[PDB]
Design a protein around this nucleic acid. Structure first.
Ligand SMILES: [Mn+2]
Length: 693
DNA sequence: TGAGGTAGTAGGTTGTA
DNA sequence: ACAACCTACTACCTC
């Protein structure tokens, strides 16, 4: 069983290629018109960069643009400029070959291929993206397969068959090259703000899951979810065909294996989790084990009347469900008690309450103070506009009053009641220990258990409970997570603390996540590092030895500040970049049955960059997405950092379902989103605090 | 919004002799 | 302008 990556490397080197270089007199969009006219006249693969143009063959038709210098020169490998220009020229040459010999259309950002299937007047188009990099005087080409949607009809087809042009109808200028989103008739829809009009014979409605009909959506989504074998066979077939007509570079007969690409293979193993002993899996420990750090939780109930008015379910059913939750929690060493403050607000929370939420909620703070709200709001009120129950609920409770809250809708309660009816229950549940035990016992064999436990986990983590930690220690003693999000000109920073080599404190940094600009200032980073050091010293009574910073995306911060700061306290550190969507794919090919598969905890390593497989999705779900790890600094071996990254992904204490990313980046992204929408507020403390999810 | 996974749509932020 | 990220939204399936 061999290991395959979606890449290849060129036998020729960056300094073994003869190129023609034309330099024009002395703006990053320069000499683009000259290059386009040159392409139009001399029909050759050409590329530009700033004010220089490079090709593989001499240019005959000058088109009146006289160059300053002409050369048959090689490239200075030490100059990144000429490396980028050669990469652009190779990319353009590949695109030109595909267009001339394989009939592909460069649309948007990808080369659209032939259609694969039409689903009731919906065309599905294959597409591929190409990338060229120069890695230590070697040329690596990577590629990624994807899909595109289309409606096969213009506006004329509908307008001939009656219908009405809606002001809010979504149409695009479906054509070649660029694409824009805005009885002859004229439509004057704005592109973004500029006024445009057309003949309505070429504008076509957009094909998106938002607007497609439910019958088409199922099949279209089913089509774009292929297995690993089909996906990578399709990816490799077209690239082999492209190779068969390319002459400017040559490759090995089988250039897709990791051996040809200079990668080394690592097989990580699943860790163990600690609840009160050592458990192989999280599910086994949570099923029949006591929590790592239990305690006492106060819960308050928010019940709206429509939940009974339009759905024939009573508040007594809600209290039976809550009693079941309480008994399950007490079975694991967690004591939850219902507050009795729900007496002055009996019968409240009607439709008028939801329609005047912004004015009839200020008096609810003393009712739910120092508790955990378990809200049972209707999904219609949460989702439908002019009410915005979820947004206002979060933005008030967690946004301003720092009160944790967990929301449940009618689908969960109807599923619970349907299971009860199936099992012969609903006669009487609350205040009956034997009936509660029977309900808990029958909950085990159903998948709905994962729902119930998830709810409990959501209550636990927001209440200061630490469900489990790592059984074994890691090579780093301290983990920091940083993420940045930009929405509508507003920048939100998410910061995250993991205090201890076993986990042992998953916490959010008590710092404001709203940035005055688009960049993280030096003061914020200094405060984050110093506060995390203080937190570790408080928790363990000793200073840490090593700290690893995880960054989502690319490191755009001041490294000199980080070392000035941790030179004084004398802790070694690393800076690591975690990249989602690397636009590559990993597999193991088995030639006995000719199948591509994936194995969780697989690592491909090259230099200071690695690809990690952290999930095991099912065939109908799709194919696993690799993560990209990049080590900026060189304090410890790359293997140890990859191990820490893989091990921190098993600390998803908010759910029973395994998550792809480590907690450091996952929870930091969630926190950045929460500050983007203004639904969280800093809270100092020393316990497990995740006031989101 | 029980949670996670993955895969389409349209836009936004960098930094580049 | 180009390249390599990021975000939001929708959808489905799995537990
Ligand atoms: Mn949640």
């Amino acid at each position: 069983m061999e290991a395959y990556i979606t890449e290849m490397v060129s036998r020729e080197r960056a300094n073994e290629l003869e190129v023609y270089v034309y330099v024009f007199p002395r703006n990053y969009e320069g000499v683009y018109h000259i290059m386009r006219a040159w392409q139009r006249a001399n029909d050759l693969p050409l590329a530009y960069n700033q004010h220089t143009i490079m090709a593989f063959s001499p240019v005959r038709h000058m088109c009146g643009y006289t160059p300053m210098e002409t050369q048959k020169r090689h490239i200075n490998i030490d100059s990144p400029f000429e490396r980028a220009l050669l990469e652009r020229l190779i990319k353009n040459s590949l695109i030109f070959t595909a267009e001339r010999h394989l009939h592909a259309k460069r649309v948007g950002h990808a080369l659209r291929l032939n259609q694969v299937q039409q689903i009731r007047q919906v065309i599905i188009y294959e597409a591929i993206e190409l990338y060229v990099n120069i890695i230590e005087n070697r040329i690596s080409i990577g590629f990624h397969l994807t899909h595109q949607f289309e409606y096969v009809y213009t506006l004329q087809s509908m307008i001939e068959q009656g219908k009405t042009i809606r002001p809010g109808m979504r149409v695009v200028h479906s054509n070649g090259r660029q694409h824009y989103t805005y009885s002859t008739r004229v439509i004057h829809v704005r592109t973004k703000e500029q006024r445009l009009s057309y003949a309505a014979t070429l504008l076509k409605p957009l094909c998106t899951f938002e607007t497609m009909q439910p019958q088409d959506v199922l099949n279209v989504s089913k089509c774009i979810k292929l297995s690993a074998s089909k996906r990578m066979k399709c990816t490799y077939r077209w690239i082999q065909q492209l190779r068969a007509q390319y002459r400017h570079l040559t490759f090995a007969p089988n250039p897709f294996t990791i051996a040809q690409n200079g990668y080394k293979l690592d097989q990580l193993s699943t860790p163990k989790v600690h609840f009160h002993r050592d458990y192989a899996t999280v599910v086994s420990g949570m099923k029949t084990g006591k929590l790592y750090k239990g305690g006492n939780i106060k819960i308050s109930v928010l019940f709206d009347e429509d939940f009974y008015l339009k759905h024939h379910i009573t508040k007594k059913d809600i209290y039976q469900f809550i009693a079941v939750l309480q008994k399950i929690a007490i079975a694991q060493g967690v004591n939850m008690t219902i507050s009795t403050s729900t007496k002055s607000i009996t019968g409240k929370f009607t439709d008028d309450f939801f329609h005047h939420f912004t004015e009839e909620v200020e008096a609810l703070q003393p009712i739910f103070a120092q508790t955990t709200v378990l809200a049972f709001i209707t999904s219609t009120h949460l989702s439908n506009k002019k009410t915005r129950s979820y947004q206002l609920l979060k933005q008030y409770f967690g946004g301003k009053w720092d009160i944790a809250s967990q929301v449940i809708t009618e689908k969960t309660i109807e599923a619970f009641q349907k299971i009860l009816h199936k099992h012969g229950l609903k006669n009487f549940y609350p205040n009956d220990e034997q009936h509660c035990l029977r309900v808990i016992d029958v909950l085990k064999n159903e998948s709905f258990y994962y729902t119930v436990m998830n709810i409990l986990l959501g209550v636990y983590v927001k209440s200061g409970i630490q469900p489990w930690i790592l059984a074994n220690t890691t090579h780093s003693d301290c983990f920091i997570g940083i993420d940045v999000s930009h929405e509508n000109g507003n920048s939100a920073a998410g910061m995250m603390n993991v205090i201890g080599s076993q986990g042992h404190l998953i916490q959010q940094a008590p710092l404001n996540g709203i940035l005055a600009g688009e960049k993280i200032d030096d003061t914020l980073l200094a405060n984050l590092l110093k506060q995390m050091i203080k937190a570790y010293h408080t928790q363990f009574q000793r200073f840490p030895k090593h700290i690893t910073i995880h960054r989502d995306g690319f490191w755009r911060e001041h490294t000199a500040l980080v070392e000035k700061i941790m030179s004084h306290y004398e802790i070694t550190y690393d800076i690591v970049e975690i990249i989602k969507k690397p636009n590559r794919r990993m597999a193991f090919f088995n030639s006995v049955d000719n199948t591509f598969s994936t194995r969780q905890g697989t690592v491909y390593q090259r230099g200071n960059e690695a690809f990690l497989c952290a999930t095991n999705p099912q065939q109908k779900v799709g194919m696993a997405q690799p993560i990209k790890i990049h080590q900026v600094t060189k304090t410890l071996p790359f293997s140890h950092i990859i191990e820490d990254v893989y091990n921190l992904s098993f600390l998803h204490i908010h759910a029973m379902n395994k998550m792809r990313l480590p907690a450091t980046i996952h929870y930091a992204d969630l926190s950045a989103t929460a500050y983007q929408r203004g639904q969280v507020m800093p809270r100092s403390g020393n316990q497990t605090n995740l006031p989101f999810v």
